[PDB]
Design a protein around this ligand. Structure first.
Ligand code: CDL
Lengths: 60, 74
C-alpha cells in the first residue's frame, strides 16, 4: 500500500471524476490491444506446425 | 440622501454582464467531459478506417493482427 500511495496516481488521476473517466477510457484502449497481441502469440506458439502459414504448399 | 439611494439603485446595473460571467464559470467546469466522450468516439470508428490511416494516428505502433492465416503465395 505504501508503494501505490507514493506514485500519486490518486492525486492526479482518480480523485476527480472527469479525470477518473479519462483514465478508464484511455487505459482500457491500450490494455485491450496488448491483451489481444499477447494471446495471439501464445496461440501461435502452442500451434506451431499446424497453422496455414507454417507449412508452405509445394506444387507438383 | 439622494446620493446614497442612487448608488444602491446602480449596484445591479450590470445584470447582463454578470450572467455572461456565469456562463464562463459553468462552461469551464463542463468542457472537460469532451475528452472521455472523444476517446470513445475515435475508439469506435478506428476499425472502419483504412490500414494506412490506422498506422499514422498511432505512430507506427499499431499493426495488422498475426493469427496465422492468409500468408504469401509461393
Ligand atoms: C490493486 C488492484 C489490481 C488488480 C489486478 C490488476 C488489474 C488490471 C489488469 C488488467 C489486465 C487486462 C484485462 C483485460 C482487458 C482487455 C480485454 C477486454 O476486455 O477485451 C474485450 C473483449 C475482447 O476484446 P477485443 O475486442 O478482442 O480487443 C481487440 C482490441 O481492442 C484491438 O483494438 P483495435 O486493434 O481495433 O484498435 C486498437 C487501437 C485503438 O486506437 C484508437 O482507437 C485510437 C488510436 C489513435 C489515438 C490518437 C491520439 C492522439 C493524441 C495523442 C496525445 C498525446 C499527448 C502526450 C503528452 C505528453 C506530455 C509529456 O489502439 C492502438 O493501436 C494502440 C494505441 C497506441 C497509441 C498510443 C495512444 C493511445 C491513446 C491515448 C489516448 C489519451 C490518453 C490520455 C487521456 C488523458 C490526458 C489527455 O470483449 C469481450 O469480452 C466482450 C464480451 C461481451 C460483453 C457484453 C457486454 C454487455 C452486452 C449487453 C449490452 C446491453 C446491456 C447494457 C450493459 C451495460 C454494462 C455496463
Amino acid at each position: 500500500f505504501k508503494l501505490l500511495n507514493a506514485t500519486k496516481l490518486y492525486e492526479y488521476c482518480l480523485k476527480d471524476n472527469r479525470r477518473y473517466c479519462m483514465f478508464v477510457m484511455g487505459v482500457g484502449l491500450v490494455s485491450s490491444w496488448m491483451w489481444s497481441e499477447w494471446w495471439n502469440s501464445v496461440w501461435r506458439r502452442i500451434n506451431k506446425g499446424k497453422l496455414y502459414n507454417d507449412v508452405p504448399y509445394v506444387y507438383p | 440622501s439622494r446620493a446614497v439611494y442612487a448608488k444602491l439603485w446602480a449596484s445591479t446595473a450590470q445584470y447582463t454582464q454578470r450572467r455572461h460571467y456565469a456562463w464562463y464559470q459553468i462552461w469551464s467546469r463542463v468542457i472537460p467531459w469532451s475528452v472521455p466522450w472523444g476517446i470513445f468516439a475515435m475508439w469506435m470508428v478506428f476499425p472502419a478506417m483504412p490500414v494506412e490511416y490506422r498506422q499514422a494516428l498511432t505512430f507506427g505502433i499499431w499493426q495488422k493482427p498475426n493469427i496465422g492465416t492468409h500468408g504469401p503465395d509461393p
